[PDB]
Design an enzyme around this catalytic site. Structure first.
Site, short mmCIF file in Angstrom:
data_model
loop_
_atom_site.label_atom_id
_atom_site.label_comp_id
_atom_site.label_asym_id
_atom_site.label_seq_id
_atom_site.Cartn_x
_atom_site.Cartn_y
_atom_site.Cartn_z
N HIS A 68 0.87 -1.17 -0.17
CA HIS A 68 0.06 -0.12 -0.05
C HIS A 68 0.71 1.22 -0.06
CE1 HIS A 68 -4.10 -1.77 1.39
NE2 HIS A 68 -3.83 -2.27 0.37
N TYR A 126 -9.47 5.42 7.65
CA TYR A 126 -9.45 5.67 9.10
C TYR A 126 -10.58 6.64 8.99
CZ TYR A 126 -5.13 3.29 10.03
OH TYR A 126 -3.88 2.32 10.16
N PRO A 144 -4.28 -0.14 19.29
CA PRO A 144 -4.17 -0.69 17.74
C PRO A 144 -4.12 0.62 16.73
CG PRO A 144 -6.27 -1.16 18.56
CD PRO A 144 -5.43 -0.93 20.04
N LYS A 191 1.11 -0.32 15.41
CA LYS A 191 2.46 -0.73 15.88
C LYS A 191 3.00 -1.87 17.09
CE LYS A 191 3.88 2.62 13.72
NZ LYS A 191 4.36 2.28 12.24
N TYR A 229 4.12 6.36 10.21
CA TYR A 229 3.24 5.37 9.61
C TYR A 229 4.16 4.23 9.08
CZ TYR A 229 -1.02 3.07 8.47
OH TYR A 229 -2.55 2.28 8.53
C1 LIG Z 1 -6.26 -9.39 22.33
C2 LIG Z 1 -5.46 -8.86 21.49
C3 LIG Z 1 -5.71 -7.94 20.36
C4 LIG Z 1 -5.06 -7.46 19.64
N1 LIG Z 1 -5.46 -6.84 18.44
C5 LIG Z 1 -4.83 -6.11 17.65
C6 LIG Z 1 -5.47 -5.51 16.65
O1 LIG Z 1 -6.61 -5.60 16.70
N2 LIG Z 1 -4.43 -5.03 15.85
C7 LIG Z 1 -3.28 -4.75 15.84
O2 LIG Z 1 -2.47 -4.14 15.07
N3 LIG Z 1 -2.52 -5.39 17.04
C8 LIG Z 1 -3.50 -6.02 17.88
N4 LIG Z 1 -2.65 -6.71 18.91
C9 LIG Z 1 -1.21 -6.49 19.12
C10 LIG Z 1 -0.50 -7.70 18.28
O3 LIG Z 1 -1.37 -8.97 18.07
C11 LIG Z 1 0.50 -8.12 19.31
O4 LIG Z 1 1.34 -6.80 19.45
C12 LIG Z 1 1.15 -9.34 18.82
O5 LIG Z 1 0.48 -10.41 18.90
C13 LIG Z 1 2.20 -9.58 20.18
O6 LIG Z 1 3.16 -10.53 19.59
P1 LIG Z 1 3.80 -11.34 20.93
O7 LIG Z 1 4.55 -12.61 20.33
O8 LIG Z 1 4.69 -10.46 21.85
O9 LIG Z 1 2.45 -11.76 21.94
P2 LIG Z 1 1.11 -12.91 21.32
O10 LIG Z 1 0.64 -12.72 20.09
O11 LIG Z 1 0.19 -12.46 22.67
O12 LIG Z 1 1.93 -14.18 21.81
C14 LIG Z 1 2.30 -14.64 23.02
C15 LIG Z 1 2.19 -16.23 23.36
O13 LIG Z 1 2.60 -16.63 24.64
C16 LIG Z 1 1.83 -17.79 24.78
N5 LIG Z 1 1.74 -17.59 26.41
C17 LIG Z 1 1.33 -16.69 27.23
N6 LIG Z 1 1.67 -17.20 28.59
C18 LIG Z 1 2.42 -18.12 28.63
C19 LIG Z 1 2.91 -18.76 29.52
N7 LIG Z 1 3.03 -18.11 31.00
N8 LIG Z 1 3.64 -19.86 29.43
C20 LIG Z 1 3.94 -20.17 27.89
N9 LIG Z 1 3.42 -19.40 26.84
C21 LIG Z 1 2.69 -18.53 27.24
C22 LIG Z 1 0.57 -17.31 24.38
O14 LIG Z 1 -0.35 -18.51 24.50
C23 LIG Z 1 0.86 -16.80 23.23
O15 LIG Z 1 0.92 -17.78 22.19
C24 LIG Z 1 -3.46 -7.53 19.69
C25 LIG Z 1 -3.01 -7.99 20.86
C26 LIG Z 1 -3.85 -8.53 21.68
C27 LIG Z 1 -3.22 -9.37 22.98
N1 LIG Z 2 -4.52 0.57 12.77
C1 LIG Z 2 -4.92 -0.82 12.01
C2 LIG Z 2 -4.85 -0.87 10.83
C3 LIG Z 2 -5.26 -2.05 10.18
C4 LIG Z 2 -5.82 -3.02 11.09
C5 LIG Z 2 -6.20 -4.51 10.66
O1 LIG Z 2 -6.58 -5.22 11.32
O2 LIG Z 2 -6.00 -4.51 9.54
C6 LIG Z 2 -5.78 -2.98 12.52
O3 LIG Z 2 -5.95 -3.79 13.30
C7 LIG Z 2 -5.38 -1.64 13.03
#
Ligand SMILES: Cc1cc2nc3c(=O)[nH]c(=O)nc-3n(C[C@H](O)[C@H](O)[C@H](O)COP(=O)(O)OP(=O)(O)OC[C@H]3O[C@@H](n4cnc5c(N)ncnc54)[C@H](O)[C@@H]3O)c2cc1C
Ligand SMILES: Nc1ccc(C(=O)O)c(O)c1
Ligand SMILES: Cc1cc2nc3c(=O)[nH]c(=O)nc-3n(C[C@H](O)[C@H](O)[C@H](O)COP(=O)(O)OP(=O)(O)OC[C@H]3O[C@@H](n4cnc5c(N)ncnc54)[C@H](O)[C@@H]3O)c2cc1C
Ligand SMILES: Nc1ccc(C(=O)O)c(O)c1
Lengths: 391, 391
Positions: free
Chosen positions: A72, A201, A293, A297, A385
């Site tokens: 994009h 947005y 979100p 980031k 961005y």
């Molecule tokens: C509910 C939620 C919604 C989100 N929605 C958005 C969104 O709409 N758009 C967006 O841009 N970003 C979103 N994010 C942020 C983005 O998904 C995260 O920044 C990203 O997943 C982080 O990656 P991670 O690997 O650090 O954590 P996670 O994806 O949370 O991975 C962590 C892993 O840890 C494992 N785990 C947890 N505790 C334990 C333990 N004690 N023992 C062993 N394993 C464990 C979990 O099962 C999971 O597999 C969201 C995050 C969350 C939590």
């Molecule tokens: N800020 C943004 C932009 C796109 C998405 C997406 O899920 O596609 C989001 O979760 C947050």
């Protein structure tokens, strides 16, 4: 068992670190509390900065993304009638973003790992960290009902917000900064053609709305909702109706609605922990920080931390420079705060806050008018961005 | 008596409008509540945007300013140890600001008016506005003890915040937006060499400080203080000591202190009234809006309003296009809100607010770090600082 680097959590953070390390010869073991299916059931993110796109290429896991991801070159902000497009490519000096589901990134990384034969333990219960400050720290867990012990040199806590890692560092060593927003996002995934070739947005008097996609036949939409709403109160009908009410009439009349595949409410929050490490434990991803979100980031900060960790771990291992790991937090926190500042700004200009007097309403509207009308302003949006440079 | 345009208030707004109009043949009468000396005793502002500099040239009142004013091509922001200089000239695309006391501007305009023989009534008591919606509105006042009546076509309310103009418009026609800051500025004028050839805005944990000048042997300094402080609590000694405590050690040790000429506390506030007119009454300057002194916009917004009014009044008078005056507010309010947004930003990043958790502290510090470190960011500061284009 014994490994070199023990990874707690198999989300994107953990797998990406696991893949980079494994590819460099550094053995790692990943311990995951859940089952693979459960992990792959999370929709979450869809927007990737260029820096992460290259990290994936470097992790050798980019075939599918290069093929199915979407580049994009612009995004659109809609406020008070108008619709303004930010040309990201020229404003950032040639950079772009790639739309590719987080679930896909995960799927791709999970394929790469299974094929490498590198160790991965799903359904690893009661994970506990021991000897975080000794020369030989260890991890214990339960698989079935047996208490196993894993010896390692380092531990990467990539277990997210509710993980065990952050809780394993003495509270008195960590300083926390936190902000909770009085609203959340109700997202909806549907197998329908997106409404725009670029994201939209929208700031509207009923609250924020967002028009995103996963592919040419799969859309992801969101609407701002009060923390008091339960997802079962929002039927598909209500969602589409509410969405349409918050978008530009011309956009709304082009919308192809349909039944939802997934629907959920994610609450907004800001959170940073300082420092991001303790002895031989290093925090990465959501285990260390959370961002609303709004500016996309989260997944992107995960990648940057992991990039910094992998590169300090190489030097320590192959080049024998273990002292470099002491600066891990210093390096990560600079990027983290900049990202936090931008996510906070994005969130404050697009969302309708409860209990806001007339002056702040006018300032929110004018913040939009100035930034979306000044060449210098559009640039601050664009460079942030697409993602500020990795240091 | 009868005139064409009746001007209420002899501050900079009123005199500048009075001079521009008189120079174009449009007769005006200025009514001032106080004595000339009292007006000339106000220190207030010292920074002028280029657009106002040219307006003064156009008012034929620029000899002295062109000679004694100082052109500045850069300003300095000091935070957490560092001192960053914003090169205004290159960042704004060649524009600069001029340092020249408000008292001087006034003095110069007052000289110009006395010489033109144009009417000016100081010590005009009990000013009241009548028939604001008729074809012939009028002003009444008392000079000595006689109630005189002045007939005019239009009335320019340039009587400031506490003036009679704004109070003469039915409350139900005006919508107000207001923000009061929980602090004020304690300023100090001294006959001593300034500490820098350019201004220094400083964010410090004890509060904001500002290093300004009026000439090569006259400095104007300010320190943020709680609204609960009375100026008699702050002796010169205390001021210098407090100032020195908030500035960079290298700057502080170069400071030439001395006895004060003037000292006062000005409270911070944001205020906008919508619309800025009623029938044949048009509001200009502080009678319509107030901005915190942080971004130096007050005197500068006065000038822009007055510029718009003078130019719509010309067309109505010489070109017979009286319908153009209906758009006065629309034109002024666009600039006003942009200026208000910038003054608010400047104020929120440089001042220490009471009752601020750790997260907002870190965001304030990072706002500074990002804007003062990004080329796109420095530009948003520069173009706003020197002043956005007149429309
Ligand atoms: C509910 C939620 C919604 C989100 N929605 C958005 C969104 O709409 N758009 C967006 O841009 N970003 C979103 N994010 C942020 C983005 O998904 C995260 O920044 C990203 O997943 C982080 O990656 P991670 O690997 O650090 O954590 P996670 O994806 O949370 O991975 C962590 C892993 O840890 C494992 N785990 C947890 N505790 C334990 C333990 N004690 N023992 C062993 N394993 C464990 C979990 O099962 C999971 O597999 C969201 C995050 C969350 C939590
Ligand atoms: N800020 C943004 C932009 C796109 C998405 C997406 O899920 O596609 C989001 O979760 C947050
Ligand atoms: C206390 C104060 C401090 C300020 N300090 C700063 C500062 O530190 N730095 C800075 O950049 N800006 C400052 N400003 C803002 C800047 O000085 C103003 O924006 C500028 O003076 C406004 O010009 P004006 O002509 O609209 O109003 P003013 O300068 O207020 O002139 C209005 C005139 O109205 C006359 N008048 C009032 N009521 C009546 C009446 N009913 N009848 C007749 N005449 C009347 C008054 O006597 C006065 O002469 C300050 C303003 C104020 C009020
Ligand atoms: N923001 C600023 C800059 C300079 C002065 C000044 O008085 O010189 C001020 O009152 C405010």
């Amino acid at each position: 068992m014994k490994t070199q680097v023990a990874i707690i959590g198999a989300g994107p953070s953990g797998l990406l670190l696991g893949q980079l390390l494994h590819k460099a010869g550094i053995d790692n073991v990943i311990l995951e509390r859940q089952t693979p299916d459960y992990v792959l059931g999370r929709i979450r993110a869809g927007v990737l900065e260029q820096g992460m796109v290259d990290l994936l290429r470097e992790a050798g896991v980019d075939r599918r993304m290069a093929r199915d991801g979407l580049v994009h070159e612009g995004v659109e902000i809609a406020f008070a009638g108008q619709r303004r497009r930010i040309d990201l490519k020229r404003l950032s000096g040639g950079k772009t973003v790639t739309v590719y589901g987080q679930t896909e990134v995960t799927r791709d990384l999970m394929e790469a790992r299974e094929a490498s034969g590198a160790t991965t333990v799903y359904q690893a219960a009661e994970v506990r960290l021991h000897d975080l400050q000794g020369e030989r720290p260890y991890v214990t867990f339960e698989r079935d009902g047996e208490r196993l012990r894993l010896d390692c040199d380092y531990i990467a806590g990539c277990d997210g917000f509710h993980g065990i890692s952050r809780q394993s560092i003495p509270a008195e060593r960590l300083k926390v900064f936190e902000r909770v927003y009085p609203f959340g996002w109700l997202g909806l995934l549907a197998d329908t053609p997106p409404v725009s070739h670029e994201l939209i947005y929208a700031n509207h008097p009923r609250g924020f709305a967002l028009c995103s996609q996963r592919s040419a036949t799969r859309s992801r939409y969101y609407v701002q909702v009060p923390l008091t709403e339960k997802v079962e109160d929002w039927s598909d009908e209500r969602f589409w109706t509410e969405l349409k009410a918050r978008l530009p009439a011309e956009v709304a009349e082009k919308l192809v609605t349909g039944p939802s595949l997934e629907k959920s409410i994610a609450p907004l929050r800001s959170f940073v922990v300082e420092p991001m490490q303790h002895g031989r434990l290093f925090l990465a991803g959501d285990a260390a920080h959370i961002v609303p979100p709004t500016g996309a980031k989260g997944l992107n900060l995960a990648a940057s931390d992991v990039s910094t960790l992998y590169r300090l771990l190489l030097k320590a291992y192959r080049e024998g420079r273990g002292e470099l790991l002491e600066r891990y937090s210093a390096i990560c926190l600079r990027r983290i705060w900049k990202a936090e500042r931008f996510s906070w700004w994005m969130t404050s200009v697009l969302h309708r806050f409860p209990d806001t007097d007339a002056f702040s309403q006018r300032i929110q509207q004018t913040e939009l008018e100035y930034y979306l009308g000044s060449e210098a302003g559009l640039a601050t949006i664009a460079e942030n961005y697409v993602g500020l440079p990795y240091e």
